[PDB]
Every structure is written in structure tokens, then in C-alpha cells.
Amino acid sequence: MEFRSLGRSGLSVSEIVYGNLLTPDEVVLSSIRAALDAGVTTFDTADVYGMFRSESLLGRALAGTPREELVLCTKVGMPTGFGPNGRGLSRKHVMESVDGSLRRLRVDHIDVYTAHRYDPATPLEELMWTFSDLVRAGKILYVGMSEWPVERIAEAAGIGARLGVPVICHMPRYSMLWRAPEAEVIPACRDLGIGQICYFTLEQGVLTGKYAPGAAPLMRRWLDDDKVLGRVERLRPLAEEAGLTTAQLALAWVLQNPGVSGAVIGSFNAEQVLANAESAGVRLETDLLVRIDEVLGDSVVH
Amino acid sequence: MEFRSLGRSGLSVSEIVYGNLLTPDEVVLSSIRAALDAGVTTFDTADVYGMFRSESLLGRALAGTPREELVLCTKVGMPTGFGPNGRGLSRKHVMESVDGSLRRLRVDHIDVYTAHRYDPATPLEELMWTFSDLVRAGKILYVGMSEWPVERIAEAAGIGARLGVPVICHMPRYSMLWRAPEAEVIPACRDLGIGQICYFTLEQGVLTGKYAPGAAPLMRRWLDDDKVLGRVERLRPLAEEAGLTTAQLALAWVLQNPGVSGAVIGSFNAEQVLANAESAGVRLETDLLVRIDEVLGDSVVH
Amino acid sequence: MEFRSLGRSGLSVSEIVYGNLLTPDEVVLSSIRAALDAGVTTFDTADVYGMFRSESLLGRALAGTPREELVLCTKVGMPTGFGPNGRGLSRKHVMESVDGSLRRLRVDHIDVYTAHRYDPATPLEELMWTFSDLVRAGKILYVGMSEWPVERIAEAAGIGARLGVPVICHMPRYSMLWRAPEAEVIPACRDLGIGQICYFTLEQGVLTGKYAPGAAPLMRRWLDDDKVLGRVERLRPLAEEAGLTTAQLALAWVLQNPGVSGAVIGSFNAEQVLANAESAGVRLETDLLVRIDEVLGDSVVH
Amino acid sequence: MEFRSLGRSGLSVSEIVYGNLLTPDEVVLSSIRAALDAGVTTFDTADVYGMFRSESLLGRALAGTPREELVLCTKVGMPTGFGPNGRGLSRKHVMESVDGSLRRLRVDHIDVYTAHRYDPATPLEELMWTFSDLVRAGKILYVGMSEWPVERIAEAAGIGARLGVPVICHMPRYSMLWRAPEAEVIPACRDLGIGQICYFTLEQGVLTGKYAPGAAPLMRRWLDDDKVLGRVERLRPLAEEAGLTTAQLALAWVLQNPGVSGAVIGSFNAEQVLANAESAGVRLETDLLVRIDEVLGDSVVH
Structure with missing residues (x-):
């Protein structure tokens, strides 16, 4: 495995991150074991x-693994209770x-606590002082944000610096096909000492090259593009030339960005987890990156 | 039920708030259940x-209700012990x-801890640093004030902002008859990101329309006005036209103020609690508001 | 009993303070009971x-008394352990x-924690941040100092204000005979919002009028003055005119200073404690204060 | 024993410090007992x-010794776990x-927690806010650094002052032979209110005078100098003239620096520990210091 700093911090993350997004218990447990x-x-x-x-x-699944060997990241913000205080980013x-989260994860601290979507109802002073109280208490170490507006990332990072809350992580959607964060989000985050942990790097199977024309919700939207699955198939020669699967090429591609700390995989197939993990440390030649862009053409979202 | 932000905060309160002000245990418990x-x-x-x-x-009464579904507000400041440290707002x-308060409420945190009346003997730095220590400790989330001078509200809000103590709530006396807070208190609170949770909205029965001339202490003072009960009776046609009881019209009237987060009801009659709760989300037409003022005339206190 | 604010704070202290300075257990316990x-x-x-x-x-002795009815003050700084970290005001x-102190007093917080003598070896930033940590922890509420240089009192009060540590109490030697703190200490403390709790108000028996010429250490130094005991005897007519004992006049005299919050008594005689406590709320006429100064003449230390 | 302030702090350390650097359990336990x-x-x-x-x-070994009689110093930074978060100075x-460290030392606080080598991967804001959280929590009292660049010492001391983290201790290599810290490190530390606790004062046996030419790693590097062991032998007359062993002269020499709080000894021989401890309080005449430099000549590293 290869490791990167998560932004401007002393924390090191594996270049491949396992994200068990939700399937029977045993399939999830065996996949985490594979990771x-x-x-x-x-x-x-x-x-x-x-x-x-x-x-x-x-x-x-992680019980028994020495605590210092694990980086545990979880989230708050999406609805988990009834009524208007059962969601969002209020102190409450x-x-x-x-x-x-601490009890279910069986730990006394979370490494990275991520604000799941920006909450326009909560003042950032209210949220960042809540994070301050949890860092003082030793319940969380570092703060992340998921799919936030760039201006709110910068505001949060500023308040965090003042309050001694490390703001080190952003979790975008980022893949060979979905490049929206390259315009403003990744540049701003690099300026603010924030690293990306990337979601949907395999675009819910589209970037595995396993799916033929005429053979999730993200995959649904991709199928509005009548050329994308055919274009991914044409990557296989490029991948094989570099001694990679299409999935390994997709994961390696995301890791070529110096703003990226890690790429998330979520596969429930033990063999795919082990294969996808070997994407770590793979350098792609510039000529390979040029003809990837030529093959995918106007299927890429900028 | 309808909900509002409590000032500039991520906290949502029900537009109708149940205030069990003190009657046998069973009457109180059944009324809370009704709420x-x-x-x-x-x-x-x-x-x-x-x-x-x-x-x-x-x-x-609230035992068993999921914590995230409840907003629990209590107070400190009025005498609960003997001697000069058994009252007021000192750190002690x-x-x-x-x-x-935490033990009796059966919770590990209070949502809104309200300073019950301004204490001229306690420096606001002393009080607001005490609130800071309780927010850091996770024992209280948000701070309120009850019937404070506007200048002390502004001072407290300033210190709170500096110390990361959310100051979000003021509890005035506010009703169709008692409008004193409209002049300075509500305007200043809106400027400071503070919402009102309103007490005596039914003026201890006067604004129910149940009491005829010649048929709590607040009701005592109202009866010095030889026209007020007759004027409230004349609201019944106005209420019925809008498909409301006089009590529902009174509660709806307070909620028409954009500075108001919630209106407190304290009824021990299960049927009245359920009826009064339906005041939430009721919009009053401007013409209705004009002739309310005409009916009540000089009984209204500005 | 009469009460005063301890400096610019919400804390109220009894004008008579019981100081059990160290006699068998039973004598101490019965004296505290008398207080x-x-x-x-x-x-x-x-x-x-x-x-x-x-x-x-x-x-x-205080076990069972409701916590809100008691103001418990203790001290740190004098040697209680072996070696150079067994004394002074270091964080350690x-x-x-x-x-x-908390375990022996049987409480979870001390009302007033007093720095017993200024420690030139400890930076005041080190001490005041230690007090900050104990206030944040809820182990102490308010900070005092005992017989400090006026310049270090002002420095401590400044840092305390910045860190939200209430600095409200100074404990001088102050009596009808010992007036050294009037020159600089009491004026500066009044400016800084600090109240005096006065020690040696009866000058270890000298100001009781019980001791005749020819009948601890402080009393030792007083006996170098060949006129002081004779001069105290001549106060008895002045005391009796005001319906007081000489001891009550001495205690009342200290309480005439607007900079004084409390006067300490330490008597092990139950009857003296009850009599001395009745000094509270006694106003002395200006003419009485003038002829006290005439009677004591050059025995008074300024 | 003689004692010194550890930098500008209220903490006193023994001029001789016992450092059990790692031999059977019993040898270590008996050596600590000897100390x-x-x-x-x-x-x-x-x-x-x-x-x-x-x-x-x-x-x-220290179990039963009253806590106030001991100054316990330990370290963090060197690898104690697997993977990239098993070492360094990250919050994690x-x-x-x-x-x-607290559990193994059988204490609820460490007196001096030392950052073992500077970690270029951790922002000093991240480290110093972690130390702040541990000081607030009462788990550590004072902060040290071991063999840091002078510029990072100054940066850490600045942030520490702002956050109320006492930064009072640096642990250099310093001996009669190894004088590298005299140029910049000791001068800067004295300016910043930091005292030295000196390692390798006996240069792993070289400065005991026990080892003859032709009779660890530090001793390995010393043996590249074909004159150093012969030069140390020539100190014995100088030592004996002052009523010292060569080892006592070496330890006394380090303590002549006003920037030094303590000199570390690590001997597993009970008799050597007791003899080396008697180096404390020994003043060396200027003429003795001049001819020490003449005897050691170009073996000294500046």
C-alpha cells in the first residue's frame, strides 16, 4: 500500500480508502477483511x-486491529432521526x-468527522465551535466536508484555524468521467491545506469496463450518454498496455491529481477489493493521460 | 405542526411550545402527553x-421520546435555595x-438554558464565561434570556459571539394585548439573531374569550380595564370568520411577527392543548389584523 | 447576618467569615457549629x-449543610509536601x-481558591492558565490572593480578565491597629473589582481588651509597644457607649471600609463566635471613629 | 541534591536526572532505587x-513515592506502532x-511531555493545539522538545505562549566533548525561557576515563578520534585535584552552563548512580575549565 498526507496535517491515509456505503452482513464483513x-x-x-x-x-470487522493502524472516517448531516433536529449540522x-458513531465504531475517537452536505440553516460559527468542543473532548481528531460550496469550505477552514480545529479533508465526486471539482474545488482546497478523499471513482460500475451498450442512480444518468459505455470499453487496450484493469486505470487516474489524498472503493467482491487496492503507487505516463481524454471525448463532465 | 429557527441558529422549535408553569401530578403528565x-x-x-x-x-412525561425529537428549555436565576447565593446568575x-436540572429532566444536556431575569450583581463576563464552561462540557447547547433590558441582551450576545456561546432566544411577555416588546426588544433581538419564545400569549385566560364582564395576577391587572373582557368577546366573529377559536386567533396573532420563533401554551385541559396546537401555520389576512386592533382599541398596551 | 459582594462578582459572603486556622477535634467542630x-x-x-x-x-462540620448556603474558601502555596515542588504556585x-482540598472539604468545587503568598519562581501566565483549567473543569469558581504585592495583584487580575478567571478576593492583615493595606492595596483592589476578606482583625487577642499590661507571634510583636494593651482597655467606654464589646468594635471597625467584603474570626469559644458574629451590620458614627484614632494614637501601624 | 528551575517555570528539577534508556528488570529497578x-x-x-x-x-520502581516528590518526563514521536500513524507528532x-504512557507510569499526569525529534509532516499549530487539549485535560503539565531545529523551538514556544501551553524544556546532546548546542540552541532557549536537560553527558562511557586506547553507537564514532580516550585519561589529575572522579567532573562541567537545568545519568551500577549524583552543586574554578579545554584540544566538537 502507498500513503499520502490528508491535506496539511500529520495524518497519513492509504491511497485506496474502503467505503462500505449502504446486502447481507457477511458480504460487508468479508469485503472489509479483504480491504x-x-x-x-x-x-x-x-x-x-x-x-x-x-x-x-x-x-x-475492525475490532482487534490496533487503533494506531486505522484511520476511521464517519459523517453527520443526513437524516438519522425524525423531525427538523434529526438532520443538518446544528450543535444539537x-x-x-x-x-x-463512537459506540457503533467501538472507538473513543473518530479520526475524520465529515460534515455531510452544507447546512444553510446553521451559522458556520455554531458548527465550528461544536467541532472545537469535540476536539477539546478528544472525541474527534480532524474535520472533513462532503460536497460543500467552495466559499463555505474557505469560511470553515478560516474559523477552524482560529479555533484549533484541523480542517484537512474534502470528499468530492471525482472520476475519469466526472471532473467538476478540477475548476475551483481542488485548487481552493490545495490553497487551504485540504486533501480530497474521492467518491464514485468507478462511477457505480461504469468505469470498470464490465458493462456493454444494451446490457444505481449515477449509472442511470450515465446511460443518457449513448457513447459512454462503448468509450470505456476502448480504454481496455490502454489499461492492458500499462498492466492494469480498466478499474485499476480509473483509480490510478484519480490518484495522479496532487490534490488527492485517497480514492474510495466500495466493492463487495473480495477479489475486486484486492485488485483495486493494487492501483496504489501506479504512475500513468503523460501520453496515456492524453489518449484517455481522446477515447472518452465529450462523455467527460468538466 | 410547523417549525421555525430559534434566532440565527441550526435549532428548530415547534411554533407552539408547551410551558408547564406551576395542580396534581396526573393533570400535568396528561397535558404534556396531549402536547x-x-x-x-x-x-x-x-x-x-x-x-x-x-x-x-x-x-x-418525556421519558422514552427519542432525544433528537425534543427541544428541552429550562431556566436559572429565580430563588431555589436559602440565602444570597440561592438565586441570581453568579457562576456559583x-x-x-x-x-x-439535568437530573430532574433525565437528560445529559439542556437545549436552551435561559437566564431568568437580569442580575445587576453579576458581571456579564462572569455569567457568559460560566455558560461557556457548560457549553464546552456539553451540559447546555444554546443560551436564552427572559425579560432582560435590551442593552444587556446586546451585551450578552456580543460576549457570547466572542466565546462561542450561542445566544439565540429571548422570552418576552407578548400577546394581542401586551405589545411592549415591539418598540425596542423584538427589533434589537432580530438584529442580534435572537428569536422570541412568547409567554402569556393567552393572558392567563383573558384572550380565550371564555370570561364575561362580572364573571391569576396578570388577569387581576387586566380587570382594572372595564372594557377588555367585552372587547375580547367581540373578537369571536373575527375568529369564526377565519375558522379559529379566539384562543387560536390569539396564538396565530403572536406567530404573525417574523421575530417570533414560538408561542407558549400552558393549558391543563387535553382538548385545549390539541386545539391551541392547531394555531401553528395559520396566516392572518391584513384586513383581519386591522379590525383586531379596532376591536381591542385602547386596551392594547404598547 | 449581613452579606456583601466579594469584589465585582455575583458571589455574596457573610460580613463575618469563620477561619479555623491551626487544639482537639471537638473544640474545632463545636466552634464551626457555633458559626x-x-x-x-x-x-x-x-x-x-x-x-x-x-x-x-x-x-x-459542614457535611449536610446545603451546598448553595456555604461559601468554602481554601488556599494553596505554603509547604504541604517534601522538596521544591511541595510548595509554591507552579502548575504542578x-x-x-x-x-x-476537594476530598477533605467533601465538595466537588471550592468557591474561592486563594494563592497563599506570591511565588516569584512561577510566571503569572503559568499560574493563571492553571486557574483557567480548574475553572473550566468546575473544580474552583473564583480566585483569591493572600498578602501579594499590589503590582502582582493588578497583573493577575489583568490575565484573569483575558482568560475568564474571576479574580475577586484579597486576604490582607487588617485591623484597628494594622492599617498598612489602606495606603495602596485596598485602593488598587477596589479599582480592580477585588474585595478584602480580612485576617487578624482581633490581632490574636490584643483587640479583645481582655489582656492587661503585665498579664502568638503577632501578639509577641505588639508587646514591644509598652502602651498598646493600656490603649485597647481605654476603648471599652467607647465600645459600651455604642452597645458593643471591644472585640465587636474591632470587627465593626474593619467592616466600615467600603473595600472590605468580610472580617475573619477564629475563636474556639462558642459564646465569643456568636457575640463576634453580631458585629455584622453595625454602623459606627464618625465621632466614634475619630476618638478611636485618638485613644490608639501612635500604636496604629500605617 | 541541588535543584534548578526548568526554564522560566515554577517547576524544579534535580540537577542530576535519571534516564533509564533501553538488561534484566531487576538491574533497572535497583538502579532507579539507587537514584x-x-x-x-x-x-x-x-x-x-x-x-x-x-x-x-x-x-x-516509583510506586509509593509521593507524587509531589517526583518529576516524571516521557516522550512521543519515535515509532511505537505499525504504519505511518505509529510515529511522529500528529494529533492522532x-x-x-x-x-x-500514563497507565505504564501509573500516574494521572506527566510533568514533562517531550516531542521526540521534529516532525516536518505535522504543522506546529496541529501539535501545539494537541498539547493544549492535554494540558486542559490535566494529562500533561509542561512541554519539552528533543534535538529540534532552533527555528522550530522558537515557533513552538510562540504558539505555546498564545495557547497557555508551558514550553520549558529542551533535551540536547551536551557533554565536555559535544558542545554543538552552545552556538545557537542554548542561547535561543535561554531567550525563550527554556532550560536544557542534557543527554549523553558521559558520552556512553568515553567521559568516565575507564577506557584506554586499544581496550554503543556514539562511542563507535568517538573511536574515529585516535586521541580522545588518551585525552580523557589526562583529565584524572584535574578531577582528583577538585576531589572528583572523571565522571563527576564531566557531569559538573555540563552543570556550569547557566542554560542547563539538569544532566541525565543512565548507569545500571548502584555505586556509580550514587557517586554521579554527588556531582550536583559542584562549582568548577575558571582555571580548571581552561586546562580541561587544553587537555581535550581538537577532540571537542563545537
Whole structure:
């Protein structure tokens, strides 16, 4: 496995991150085991994933692994309770969420606590002072944000610096096909000392090259493009030339960005987890990157 | 039920708040149950109400309700012990009050801790640093004030902003008849990101229209006005035209103010609680508001 | 009993403070009981008094009294352990002292924690950040100083204001005979919002009028003055004219200073404690104060 | 024993510090006992020394000694776990290291927690806010650094002052032969209120005078100097003239620097510990210091 700093911080994450997004218990547990076996250190989940089930299964699967060998990331913000305080980023919801996450993960601290979507109803002073109280308490170490507006990332990072809350992580959608964060988000985050942990790097199967024309919700939207699956198939020669699968090429491609700390995989197939983990440390030649862009053409979203 | 932000905060309160101000245990418990059944989320009490009895009964009645579904507000400042440190807003009295309130309410945090009347003997730096220590400790989330001078509200809000203490709530007397807070208090609070949770909205029965001329202490003072009960009776046609009781019109009237987060009801009649709760989300036409003012005339206190 | 604010704070102390300075256990316990019976709320001790014995006896005697009715003051700084970290005001000694004081006093917080003598070896930033940590932790509420240089009082008060540590109390030697603090200490403390709790108000028996010429250490130094005991005897007519004992006149005299919050008594005679407590609320006429100064003449230390 | 302030702080350390650097358990335990018997108060160790064994043995040997009589120093930064978060000075590694050190040392606080080597991967804001959280929590009292660049010492001291983290200790290599820290490190530390606790004062046996030409790693490098052992032998007359062993002269020499708080000894011979401890309080005449420099000549590293 290869490792990167998560932004401007002393924290190191595995270049491949296992994200058990929610399937029977045994399939999830065996997939997490496969990730550990492959040298993955960094595990991502959320309170909302399988409504607490993802956190509980990660807690069980990681039990016994020395705490210093694991980077545990979870989230708060999506609805996990009834009524208007059962969601969002208020001091109330964040304070009522953290102890449940700690108990289900079977730990006394979370490495990276991520604000799941920006909450326009919560003043950033209210949220960042709540994070300050949890860092002072030793319940969370570092703060992340998921799919936030760039201006709110910068505001949060500023307040965090003032309050001694490390703001080190952003979790975008980023793949060979989905490049929206390259314009403003990744540049701003690099300026602010924030690293990306990338979601949907295999675009829910589209970038595996396993699916032929005429053979999730993201995959649904991709199928509005009548050329994308045919274009991914044409990557296989490019991948094989570099001694990679199409999936390994997709994961390696995301890791070529110096703003990226890690790429998330979520496969429930033990063999795919081990193969996808070997994407770490792979350098792609510039000529390979040029003809990837030529093959995918106007299927790429900028 | 309808919900509002409590000032500039991520906290949402029910537009109707149940305030069990202090009657046998069973009447109080059944009234709180009626409020829960009506979709009321936000409950107000104080250490001093029935000398600890109100907090203990709210703790019992709300037991089993998921914590994230409830907004629990209590108070400190009125006398609950003997001698000059048994009252007021000193670090000593506030620190010696909070654990009793938590134990009686059966919770590990209070959503809104309200300073019950301004204490000229306590420096606001002393009080606001005490609130800071309780927010850091996770014992209180948000701070309120009850019937404070506007200048002390602004001072408290300033210090709170500096110390990361959310100051989000003021509890005035506010009704169709008692409009004193409109002049300075509500305008200043809106400027400071503070929402009103309104007390005596039914003026201890005067604004129910149930009481005829010649048929609590506030009701005592109202009866010095030889026209007020007759004027409230003349609202019934206006209420019925809008498909409301006089009590529902009174509660709806307070909620028409954009500075108001919630209106407190305290009825011990299960049927009245359910009826009064349906005041939430009711919009009053401007013409209705004009002739309310015409009917009540010089009985209104500005 | 009469009460005063302890400096610019919300804390109220009894004008008569019981200080069990160190005699058999039973004499100490019965004297504390006598003070409680007389309406004394405010008790002073120190780790060093009878090497932990004073704190343990106060803890036992005050057991059962509601916490809100008591103001418990203790001290740190004098030697209570072996070696150079067994004394002074270092973070180490203060942090290793506080839990012992809490356990012996049988409380979870000390109202007033007093720095017993200024420690030139400890930076005031080091001491005041230690006090900050104990206030944040809820182990101490308010900070005092005993016989400090005026410049270090002002420095401590400044840092305290910045860190949200209430600095409200100074404990001088102050009596009808010992007036050294009037020149600079009391004026500066009044400016800084600090109240005096006065020690040696009866000058170890000299100001009781019980001791005749030819009939601790402070009393030793007083006997170098060949006129002081004769001069105190001549106060008895002045005292009796005002319906006071000489001891009550001495205690009342200290309380005439607007900079004084409280006067400490330490008598082991139950009858004297009850009599001395009645000094509270006594106003002395200006003509009485003038002829006190005439009677004592050059025995007074300025 | 003689004592010094550890930098600008209220903490006093013994001029001789026992450092059980890692031999059977019994030899280590008896050596620590010998140090206690000699009046040594100040004990240094590290998580990494004998991989947790040094801390566990110090915890056992010091059990029963009153806490106020001991200054316990340990370290974090060197590898104690697998993978890239099992070492360095990240919030993660520091937070995951401190409770192990407390449990093995059998204490609820460490007097001096030393950052073992500068970590270029961790922002000093991240490290110093972690130290702030541990000082607030009462788990560590004072902060040290070991063999840091002078510019990072100054940066850390600045942030520490702002956050109320006492930065009081630097642990250089310093001996009669190794004088590198005299140029910049000791001068800067004296300016910043930091005292030295000196390692390798006997240069792993070279400065004992026990080893003849032709009779570890530091001793290995010294033997590249074909004159150093012969030059140390020529100190014996100088030592004997002052009533010292060569080892006592070496330890006394380090203590002549006003920037030095303490000199570390690590001997496993009970007799050597007691003899070396008597180096404390020894003043060396200027003429003695001049001819030491003449005897050692170009063997000294500046």
C-alpha cells in the first residue's frame, strides 16, 4: 500500500480508502477483511449508511486491529432521526450524533468527522465551535466536508484555524468521467491545506469496463450518454498496455491529481477489493493521460 | 405542526411550545402527553416552577421520546435555595443549578438554558464565561434570556459571539394585548439573531374569550380595564370568520411577527392543548389584523 | 447576618467569615457549629492549616449543610509536601493540591481558591492558565490572593480578565491597629473589582481588651509597644457607649471600609463566635471613629 | 541534591536526572532505587525505550513515592506502532500515545511531555493545539522538545505562549566533548525561557576515563578520534585535584552552563548512580575549565 498526507496535517491515509456505503452482513464483513488484507488503513462510513448498520459492521470487522493502524472516517448531516433536529449540522444534531458513531465504531475517537452536505440553516460559527468542543473532548481528531460550496469550505477552514480545529479533508465526486471539482474545488482546497478523499471513482460500475451498450442512480444518468459505455470499453487496450484493469486505470487516474489524498472503493467482491487496492503507487505516463481524454471525448463532465 | 429557527441558529422549535408553569401530578403528565400527541417538540420549564416539581414531571412525561425529537428549555436565576447565593446568575448559583436540572429532566444536556431575569450583581463576563464552561462540557447547547433590558441582551450576545456561546432566544411577555416588546426588544433581538419564545400569549385566560364582564395576577391587572373582557368577546366573529377559536386567533396573532420563533401554551385541559396546537401555520389576512386592533382599541398596551 | 459582594462578582459572603486556622477535634467542630448557628455562611481554611486537619474538620462540620448556603474558601502555596515542588504556585503544585482540598472539604468545587503568598519562581501566565483549567473543569469558581504585592495583584487580575478567571478576593492583615493595606492595596483592589476578606482583625487577642499590661507571634510583636494593651482597655467606654464589646468594635471597625467584603474570626469559644458574629451590620458614627484614632494614637501601624 | 528551575517555570528539577534508556528488570529497578536514595527527583523515559518496558519499570520502581516528590518526563514521536500513524507528532499519534504512557507510569499526569525529534509532516499549530487539549485535560503539565531545529523551538514556544501551553524544556546532546548546542540552541532557549536537560553527558562511557586506547553507537564514532580516550585519561589529575572522579567532573562541567537545568545519568551500577549524583552543586574554578579545554584540544566538537 502507498500513503499520502490528508491535506496539511500529520495524518497519513492509504491511497485506496474502503467505503462500505449502504446486502447481507457477511458480504460487508468479508469485503472489509479483504480491504485490511490488501493493506487498506483508511475506512469511511456515515451514520446514515444503512441507517447505523454500516458503522456497526465497520466497528465489528475492525475490532482487534490496533487503533494506531486505522484511520476511521464517519459523517453527520443526513437524516438519522425524525423531525427538523434529526438532520443538518446544528450543535444539537452534531452533539446528539457523535456518541452513537463512537459506540457503533467501538472507538473513543473518530479520526475524520465529515460534515455531510452544507447546512444553510446553521451559522458556520455554531458548527465550528461544536467541532472545537469535540476536539477539546478528544472525541474527534480532524474535520472533513462532503460536497460543500467552495466559499463555505474557505469560511470553515478560516474559523477552524482560529479555533484549533484541523480542517484537512474534502470528499468530492471525482472520476475519469466526472471532473467538476478540477475548476475551483481542488485548487481552493490545495490553497487551504485540504486533501480530497474521492467518491464514485468507478462511477457505480461504469468505469470498470464490465458493462456493454444494451446490457444505481449515477449509472442511470450515465446511460443518457449513448457513447459512454462503448468509450470505456476502448480504454481496455490502454489499461492492458500499462498492466492494469480498466478499474485499476480509473483509480490510478484519480490518484495522479496532487490534490488527492485517497480514492474510495466500495466493492463487495473480495477479489475486486484486492485488485483495486493494487492501483496504489501506479504512475500513468503523460501520453496515456492524453489518449484517455481522446477515447472518452465529450462523455467527460468538466 | 410547523417549525421555525430559534434566532440565527441550526435549532428548530415547534411554533407552539408547551410551558408547564406551576395542580396534581396526573393533570400535568396528561397535558404534556396531549402536547406530544399534537406534535409539540419544544417544552419549557424552570428550576423554580413548583420548586423543582415542573422539571421532574417534564422529565417523567418525556421519558422514552427519542432525544433528537425534543427541544428541552429550562431556566436559572429565580430563588431555589436559602440565602444570597440561592438565586441570581453568579457562576456559583449557575454551576450549582445545572446538574439538578439535568437530573430532574433525565437528560445529559439542556437545549436552551435561559437566564431568568437580569442580575445587576453579576458581571456579564462572569455569567457568559460560566455558560461557556457548560457549553464546552456539553451540559447546555444554546443560551436564552427572559425579560432582560435590551442593552444587556446586546451585551450578552456580543460576549457570547466572542466565546462561542450561542445566544439565540429571548422570552418576552407578548400577546394581542401586551405589545411592549415591539418598540425596542423584538427589533434589537432580530438584529442580534435572537428569536422570541412568547409567554402569556393567552393572558392567563383573558384572550380565550371564555370570561364575561362580572364573571391569576396578570388577569387581576387586566380587570382594572372595564372594557377588555367585552372587547375580547367581540373578537369571536373575527375568529369564526377565519375558522379559529379566539384562543387560536390569539396564538396565530403572536406567530404573525417574523421575530417570533414560538408561542407558549400552558393549558391543563387535553382538548385545549390539541386545539391551541392547531394555531401553528395559520396566516392572518391584513384586513383581519386591522379590525383586531379596532376591536381591542385602547386596551392594547404598547 | 449581613452579606456583601466579594469584589465585582455575583458571589455574596457573610460580613463575618469563620477561619479555623491551626487544639482537639471537638473544640474545632463545636466552634464551626457555633458559626453556622450565628448565620456565618463563609468559611476559610488552607491545605497547610494543621497540615490538612483544618480542611478535614471543616468538611466534617459542614457535611449536610446545603451546598448553595456555604461559601468554602481554601488556599494553596505554603509547604504541604517534601522538596521544591511541595510548595509554591507552579502548575504542578496547584494541580497536585486541588483534589486533596476537594476530598477533605467533601465538595466537588471550592468557591474561592486563594494563592497563599506570591511565588516569584512561577510566571503569572503559568499560574493563571492553571486557574483557567480548574475553572473550566468546575473544580474552583473564583480566585483569591493572600498578602501579594499590589503590582502582582493588578497583573493577575489583568490575565484573569483575558482568560475568564474571576479574580475577586484579597486576604490582607487588617485591623484597628494594622492599617498598612489602606495606603495602596485596598485602593488598587477596589479599582480592580477585588474585595478584602480580612485576617487578624482581633490581632490574636490584643483587640479583645481582655489582656492587661503585665498579664502568638503577632501578639509577641505588639508587646514591644509598652502602651498598646493600656490603649485597647481605654476603648471599652467607647465600645459600651455604642452597645458593643471591644472585640465587636474591632470587627465593626474593619467592616466600615467600603473595600472590605468580610472580617475573619477564629475563636474556639462558642459564646465569643456568636457575640463576634453580631458585629455584622453595625454602623459606627464618625465621632466614634475619630476618638478611636485618638485613644490608639501612635500604636496604629500605617 | 541541588535543584534548578526548568526554564522560566515554577517547576524544579534535580540537577542530576535519571534516564533509564533501553538488561534484566531487576538491574533497572535497583538502579532507579539507587537514584531515589541519592535524592534524584527527576526521571526521564520514552514510550520507545525498550518498547514500553522503560515506562513500565519506572512506574513500578516509583510506586509509593509521593507524587509531589517526583518529576516524571516521557516522550512521543519515535515509532511505537505499525504504519505511518505509529510515529511522529500528529494529533492522532500524540492522542493515541498519552494514555499508554500514563497507565505504564501509573500516574494521572506527566510533568514533562517531550516531542521526540521534529516532525516536518505535522504543522506546529496541529501539535501545539494537541498539547493544549492535554494540558486542559490535566494529562500533561509542561512541554519539552528533543534535538529540534532552533527555528522550530522558537515557533513552538510562540504558539505555546498564545495557547497557555508551558514550553520549558529542551533535551540536547551536551557533554565536555559535544558542545554543538552552545552556538545557537542554548542561547535561543535561554531567550525563550527554556532550560536544557542534557543527554549523553558521559558520552556512553568515553567521559568516565575507564577506557584506554586499544581496550554503543556514539562511542563507535568517538573511536574515529585516535586521541580522545588518551585525552580523557589526562583529565584524572584535574578531577582528583577538585576531589572528583572523571565522571563527576564531566557531569559538573555540563552543570556550569547557566542554560542547563539538569544532566541525565543512565548507569545500571548502584555505586556509580550514587557517586554521579554527588556531582550536583559542584562549582568548577575558571582555571580548571581552561586546562580541561587544553587537555581535550581538537577532540571537542563545537
